Amino acid sequence: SVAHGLAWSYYIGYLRLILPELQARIRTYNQHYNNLLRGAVSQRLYILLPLDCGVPDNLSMADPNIRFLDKLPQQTGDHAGIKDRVYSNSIYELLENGQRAGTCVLEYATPLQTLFAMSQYSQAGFSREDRLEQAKLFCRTLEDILADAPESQNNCRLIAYQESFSLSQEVLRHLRQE
Amino acid sequence: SVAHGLAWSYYIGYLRLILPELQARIRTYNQHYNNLLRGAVSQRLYILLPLDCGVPDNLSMADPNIRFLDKLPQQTGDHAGIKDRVYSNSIYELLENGQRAGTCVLEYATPLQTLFAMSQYSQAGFSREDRLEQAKLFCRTLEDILADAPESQNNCRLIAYQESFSLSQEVLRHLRQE
Ligand SMILES: Nc1nc2c(ncn2[C@@H]2O[C@@H]3COP(=O)(O)O[C@H]4[C@@H](O)[C@H](n5cnc6c(N)ncnc65)O[C@@H]4COP(=O)(O)O[C@H]2[C@@H]3O)c(=O)[nH]1
């Protein structure tokens, strides 16, 4: 299954590698690089899962209330022959009524971009209906992996959505629960 | 198909992104950072495809004649909400009879590590026989993608192998053809 392989590669090649050290990288940022007068970055990696697989490269293009602020400390390591491969994450501010209502580590799940592009390339033999069903299967498999995964211990939140709708608000709703 | 999705994600999320700018990054290295007295780095990205999916993180652990030298200039760009995500590659020297017989950009195809780990995790429902058959399907799909891909224009070489056997020699054989 396309989505089954994609869900497992996202855990094996990314989540299980960065989640153990995520809270440490955030506490490091909150103490030494975060502006002294600002709210602390929240402790979890928030992952956006648009089921229509529309994954823009700039998050501020999906909502103007979502604005880039800073990058976490970079995590590097040797991986499949690549020396010091860089895993980077970005901190965003979420604006409500124009003012900062919260800060969090936010990104899209990249494998959804793969399902999108696969639906566009003829040689992939992958229809736009395949995409919606595989997008849902990808998220189910992922939350099933992370439930049993030892690396996910209150440090990761999946935010699936389908499109009116405000992404900045959908994130803030999860953020306000904690 | 697990390998079908993995082969397409490797093209969409990596090869089609780095191959257009690979030769430019190599010429930049050969002129400004390569030691003036050394042989030029070859122009292609050589990708190792062990069908047993044994992908060590340090290439020198698979063969002592393969020694790290330097990194190419890093390629950065915004991707799925990650600002300045870093794509890095490593240059290796290949020793024959103890002396440098060639230099090239070399790495393993990371999705093979995914197939390996999937075969080890019970929740993946993926047997070691599934792995060998999916490993072969992954490479077939990949070379079929790159044949028709506009980004692959004499800048990428797939080296599939199955294990005596010397990895440094198998690479040098491809290198000596050109
Ligand atoms: N050698 C090498 N291969 C790379 C690199 N980046 C991607 N690949 C490969 O391309 C394929 C698809 O790319 P994608 O981002 O869709 O999936 C990635 C992506 O969702 C997530 N991920 C991995 N590294 C990062 C990262 N640095 N930043 C954000 N997300 C990441 O986990 C998935 C699996 O990662 P893997 O690791 O196996 O790299 C393979 C991947 O199979 C790279 O920088 N170096």
Short mmCIF file of all heavy atoms in Angstrom, two decimals, chain A residues 9-10 13-14 79 82 85-88 107 110-111 114, chain B residues 9-10 13-14 79 82 85-88 107-108 110-111 114, ligand 1:
data_model
loop_
_atom_site.label_atom_id
_atom_site.label_comp_id
_atom_site.label_asym_id
_atom_site.label_seq_id
_atom_site.Cartn_x
_atom_site.Cartn_y
_atom_site.Cartn_z
N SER A 9 7.64 5.24 6.43
CA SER A 9 8.89 5.96 6.15
C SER A 9 8.94 7.29 6.91
O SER A 9 10.01 7.73 7.34
CB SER A 9 9.06 6.17 4.65
OG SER A 9 8.89 7.50 4.29
N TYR A 10 7.78 7.93 7.11
CA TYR A 10 7.74 9.18 7.88
C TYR A 10 8.11 8.94 9.35
O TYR A 10 8.74 9.78 9.99
CB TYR A 10 6.35 9.80 7.76
CG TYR A 10 6.19 11.25 8.24
CD1 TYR A 10 7.00 12.27 7.75
CD2 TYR A 10 5.21 11.58 9.16
CE1 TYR A 10 6.82 13.60 8.19
CE2 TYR A 10 5.02 12.89 9.59
CZ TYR A 10 5.82 13.90 9.10
OH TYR A 10 5.63 15.19 9.54
N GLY A 13 12.09 7.36 9.10
CA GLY A 13 13.08 8.29 8.62
C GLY A 13 12.97 9.70 9.15
O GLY A 13 13.77 10.56 8.76
N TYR A 14 12.02 9.99 10.04
CA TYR A 14 11.89 11.36 10.53
C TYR A 14 11.42 11.43 11.98
O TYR A 14 12.16 11.90 12.85
CB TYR A 14 10.92 12.14 9.65
CG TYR A 14 10.79 13.62 10.02
CD1 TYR A 14 11.91 14.45 10.10
CD2 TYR A 14 9.55 14.18 10.25
CE1 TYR A 14 11.79 15.80 10.41
CE2 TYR A 14 9.40 15.54 10.56
CZ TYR A 14 10.53 16.33 10.64
OH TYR A 14 10.39 17.67 10.97
N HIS A 79 23.56 9.64 8.23
CA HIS A 79 22.35 8.93 7.81
C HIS A 79 22.54 8.42 6.38
O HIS A 79 22.64 9.22 5.45
CB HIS A 79 21.13 9.84 7.91
CG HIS A 79 19.84 9.12 8.11
ND1 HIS A 79 18.93 8.92 7.09
CD2 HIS A 79 19.30 8.54 9.21
CE1 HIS A 79 17.89 8.26 7.55
NE2 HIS A 79 18.08 8.01 8.83
N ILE A 82 25.22 9.99 4.31
CA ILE A 82 25.26 11.45 4.33
C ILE A 82 25.83 11.87 5.67
O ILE A 82 25.26 11.57 6.73
CB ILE A 82 23.86 12.04 4.12
CG1 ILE A 82 23.27 11.57 2.79
CG2 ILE A 82 23.89 13.57 4.18
CD1 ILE A 82 23.96 12.16 1.58
N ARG A 85 23.73 15.13 8.07
CA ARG A 85 22.46 15.49 7.45
C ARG A 85 21.65 16.34 8.42
O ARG A 85 21.58 16.03 9.62
CB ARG A 85 21.68 14.25 7.03
CG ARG A 85 20.31 14.55 6.47
CD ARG A 85 19.64 13.31 5.91
NE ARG A 85 18.21 13.54 5.68
CZ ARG A 85 17.40 12.65 5.12
NH1 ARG A 85 17.85 11.47 4.73
NH2 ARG A 85 16.12 12.95 4.96
N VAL A 86 21.05 17.41 7.92
CA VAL A 86 20.45 18.45 8.75
C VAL A 86 18.94 18.25 8.81
O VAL A 86 18.27 18.22 7.77
CB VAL A 86 20.79 19.85 8.21
CG1 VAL A 86 20.08 20.92 9.03
CG2 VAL A 86 22.29 20.05 8.22
N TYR A 87 18.42 18.14 10.03
CA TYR A 87 16.98 18.12 10.29
C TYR A 87 16.65 19.44 10.98
O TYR A 87 17.10 19.70 12.10
CB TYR A 87 16.59 16.91 11.14
CG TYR A 87 16.95 15.60 10.50
CD1 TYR A 87 18.24 15.09 10.59
CD2 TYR A 87 16.02 14.89 9.76
CE1 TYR A 87 18.59 13.89 9.98
CE2 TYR A 87 16.36 13.69 9.15
CZ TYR A 87 17.64 13.20 9.26
OH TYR A 87 17.95 12.01 8.65
N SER A 88 15.90 20.29 10.30
CA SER A 88 15.55 21.60 10.82
C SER A 88 14.04 21.71 10.98
O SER A 88 13.28 21.05 10.27
CB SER A 88 16.07 22.72 9.90
OG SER A 88 16.09 23.97 10.57
N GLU A 107 4.54 22.39 10.97
CA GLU A 107 4.95 22.00 9.63
C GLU A 107 3.89 21.07 9.06
O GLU A 107 3.10 20.48 9.79
CB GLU A 107 6.32 21.30 9.62
CG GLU A 107 6.30 19.92 10.26
CD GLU A 107 7.68 19.42 10.61
OE1 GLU A 107 8.49 20.23 11.11
OE2 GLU A 107 7.96 18.22 10.38
N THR A 110 5.24 16.15 4.93
CA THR A 110 5.74 16.10 3.56
C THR A 110 5.20 14.95 2.71
O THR A 110 4.93 15.18 1.52
CB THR A 110 7.27 16.06 3.63
OG1 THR A 110 7.64 15.18 4.69
CG2 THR A 110 7.82 17.41 3.99
N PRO A 111 5.00 13.73 3.22
CA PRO A 111 4.50 12.66 2.33
C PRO A 111 3.17 12.97 1.68
O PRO A 111 2.81 12.29 0.71
CB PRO A 111 4.37 11.46 3.28
CG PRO A 111 5.30 11.73 4.37
CD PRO A 111 5.26 13.21 4.57
N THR A 114 3.90 14.14 -1.66
CA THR A 114 4.16 13.01 -2.55
C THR A 114 2.87 12.46 -3.15
O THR A 114 2.83 12.13 -4.34
CB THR A 114 4.90 11.91 -1.78
OG1 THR A 114 6.17 12.40 -1.31
CG2 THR A 114 5.13 10.70 -2.66
N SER B 9 8.27 8.79 -3.94
CA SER B 9 8.62 9.83 -2.97
C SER B 9 10.10 10.20 -3.05
O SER B 9 10.47 11.36 -2.84
CB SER B 9 8.23 9.39 -1.56
OG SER B 9 9.35 9.10 -0.78
N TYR B 10 10.96 9.23 -3.38
CA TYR B 10 12.39 9.51 -3.54
C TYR B 10 12.64 10.44 -4.74
O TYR B 10 13.54 11.29 -4.71
CB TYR B 10 13.15 8.20 -3.70
CG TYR B 10 14.68 8.27 -3.57
CD1 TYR B 10 15.30 8.81 -2.46
CD2 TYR B 10 15.49 7.73 -4.57
CE1 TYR B 10 16.71 8.85 -2.35
CE2 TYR B 10 16.87 7.76 -4.48
CZ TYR B 10 17.48 8.30 -3.37
OH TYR B 10 18.86 8.33 -3.29
N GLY B 13 10.41 13.96 -3.71
CA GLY B 13 10.92 14.68 -2.57
C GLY B 13 12.43 14.82 -2.50
O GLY B 13 12.94 15.41 -1.53
N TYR B 14 13.18 14.31 -3.47
CA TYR B 14 14.64 14.40 -3.38
C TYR B 14 15.31 14.55 -4.74
O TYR B 14 15.92 15.59 -5.01
CB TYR B 14 15.20 13.17 -2.68
CG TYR B 14 16.71 13.21 -2.44
CD1 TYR B 14 17.30 14.28 -1.77
CD2 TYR B 14 17.52 12.18 -2.86
CE1 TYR B 14 18.67 14.32 -1.54
CE2 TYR B 14 18.90 12.19 -2.63
CZ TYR B 14 19.46 13.26 -1.97
OH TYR B 14 20.82 13.29 -1.76
N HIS B 79 10.22 24.14 2.10
CA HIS B 79 9.62 22.85 1.73
C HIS B 79 8.61 22.45 2.80
O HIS B 79 8.98 22.18 3.94
CB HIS B 79 10.70 21.79 1.57
CG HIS B 79 10.33 20.67 0.64
ND1 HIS B 79 9.94 19.43 1.09
CD2 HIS B 79 10.30 20.62 -0.71
CE1 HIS B 79 9.68 18.65 0.06
NE2 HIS B 79 9.89 19.35 -1.05
N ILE B 82 8.83 24.09 6.14
CA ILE B 82 10.16 24.15 6.72
C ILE B 82 10.94 25.22 5.98
O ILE B 82 11.15 25.12 4.76
CB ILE B 82 10.87 22.79 6.63
CG1 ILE B 82 10.05 21.71 7.35
CG2 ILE B 82 12.29 22.86 7.21
CD1 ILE B 82 10.03 21.87 8.85
N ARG B 85 15.16 24.30 4.51
CA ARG B 85 15.48 22.89 4.71
C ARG B 85 16.75 22.55 3.94
O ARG B 85 16.92 22.96 2.79
CB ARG B 85 14.32 22.00 4.28
CG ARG B 85 14.63 20.52 4.38
CD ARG B 85 13.41 19.66 4.11
NE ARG B 85 13.78 18.27 3.87
CZ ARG B 85 12.91 17.29 3.69
NH1 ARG B 85 11.61 17.53 3.70
NH2 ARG B 85 13.33 16.05 3.48
N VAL B 86 17.65 21.81 4.58
CA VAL B 86 19.01 21.61 4.08
C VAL B 86 19.11 20.25 3.40
O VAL B 86 18.82 19.21 4.02
CB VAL B 86 20.03 21.72 5.22
CG1 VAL B 86 21.44 21.41 4.70
CG2 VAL B 86 19.97 23.10 5.84
N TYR B 87 19.54 20.26 2.14
CA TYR B 87 19.87 19.05 1.39
C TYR B 87 21.38 19.04 1.22
O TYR B 87 21.95 19.91 0.54
CB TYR B 87 19.14 19.02 0.04
CG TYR B 87 17.63 19.08 0.19
CD1 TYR B 87 16.98 20.29 0.38
CD2 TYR B 87 16.87 17.92 0.18
CE1 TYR B 87 15.60 20.34 0.53
CE2 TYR B 87 15.50 17.96 0.34
CZ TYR B 87 14.87 19.18 0.51
OH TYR B 87 13.50 19.21 0.66
N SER B 88 22.04 18.09 1.86
CA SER B 88 23.49 17.99 1.83
C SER B 88 23.91 16.68 1.19
O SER B 88 23.18 15.69 1.24
CB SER B 88 24.09 18.11 3.24
OG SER B 88 25.48 18.42 3.18
N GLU B 107 26.16 7.98 -1.99
CA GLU B 107 25.24 7.82 -0.87
C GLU B 107 24.37 6.61 -1.15
O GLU B 107 24.23 6.16 -2.29
CB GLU B 107 24.37 9.06 -0.65
CG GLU B 107 23.33 9.28 -1.75
CD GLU B 107 22.76 10.68 -1.74
OE1 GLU B 107 23.55 11.63 -1.54
OE2 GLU B 107 21.54 10.82 -1.93
N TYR B 108 23.77 6.08 -0.08
CA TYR B 108 22.76 5.05 -0.18
C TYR B 108 21.39 5.68 -0.45
O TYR B 108 21.12 6.81 -0.06
CB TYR B 108 22.67 4.25 1.13
CG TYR B 108 23.81 3.30 1.39
CD1 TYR B 108 24.87 3.66 2.21
CD2 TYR B 108 23.82 2.02 0.84
CE1 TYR B 108 25.90 2.80 2.46
CE2 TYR B 108 24.85 1.15 1.10
CZ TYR B 108 25.90 1.54 1.90
OH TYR B 108 26.94 0.68 2.16
N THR B 110 18.13 6.12 0.84
CA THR B 110 17.50 6.03 2.15
C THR B 110 16.23 5.18 2.20
O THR B 110 16.05 4.46 3.20
CB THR B 110 17.22 7.46 2.63
OG1 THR B 110 16.74 8.21 1.51
CG2 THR B 110 18.50 8.12 3.07
N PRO B 111 15.33 5.18 1.21
CA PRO B 111 14.12 4.36 1.34
C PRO B 111 14.39 2.88 1.54
O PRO B 111 13.48 2.15 1.94
CB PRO B 111 13.38 4.60 0.02
CG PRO B 111 13.86 5.90 -0.45
CD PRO B 111 15.30 5.96 -0.04
N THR B 114 14.12 2.22 5.08
CA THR B 114 12.72 2.09 5.46
C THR B 114 12.22 0.66 5.28
O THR B 114 11.49 0.13 6.13
CB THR B 114 11.86 3.06 4.65
OG1 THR B 114 12.26 4.41 4.91
CG2 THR B 114 10.39 2.90 4.98
N1 LIG C 1 20.20 11.25 1.23
C1 LIG C 1 19.05 12.10 1.44
N2 LIG C 1 17.84 11.63 1.12
C2 LIG C 1 16.69 12.47 1.33
C3 LIG C 1 16.80 13.76 1.86
N3 LIG C 1 15.53 14.39 1.96
C4 LIG C 1 14.64 13.47 1.49
N4 LIG C 1 15.32 12.27 1.08
C5 LIG C 1 14.57 11.09 0.51
O1 LIG C 1 13.42 11.46 -0.28
C6 LIG C 1 12.30 10.65 0.04
C7 LIG C 1 10.98 11.49 0.18
O2 LIG C 1 11.28 12.74 0.65
P1 LIG C 1 10.23 13.41 1.85
O3 LIG C 1 10.80 14.64 2.44
O4 LIG C 1 8.99 13.18 1.03
O5 LIG C 1 9.94 12.28 3.13
C8 LIG C 1 10.54 12.44 4.29
C9 LIG C 1 9.90 13.57 5.11
O6 LIG C 1 8.52 13.41 5.21
C10 LIG C 1 10.44 13.28 6.50
N5 LIG C 1 11.72 14.05 6.67
C11 LIG C 1 13.01 13.47 6.59
N6 LIG C 1 14.00 14.40 6.77
C12 LIG C 1 13.34 15.64 6.95
C13 LIG C 1 13.85 16.97 7.19
N7 LIG C 1 15.21 17.29 7.28
N8 LIG C 1 12.94 17.99 7.34
C14 LIG C 1 11.59 17.67 7.26
N9 LIG C 1 11.03 16.46 7.04
C15 LIG C 1 11.94 15.43 6.88
O7 LIG C 1 10.64 11.83 6.52
C16 LIG C 1 10.30 11.26 5.22
C17 LIG C 1 11.25 10.01 4.93
O8 LIG C 1 12.57 10.49 4.99
P2 LIG C 1 13.98 9.79 4.32
O9 LIG C 1 15.10 10.21 5.19
O10 LIG C 1 13.62 8.36 4.05
O11 LIG C 1 14.44 10.50 2.80
C18 LIG C 1 14.12 10.04 1.56
C19 LIG C 1 12.58 9.99 1.36
O12 LIG C 1 12.15 8.65 1.38
C20 LIG C 1 18.10 14.28 2.22
O13 LIG C 1 18.38 15.38 2.70
N10 LIG C 1 19.24 13.40 1.99
#
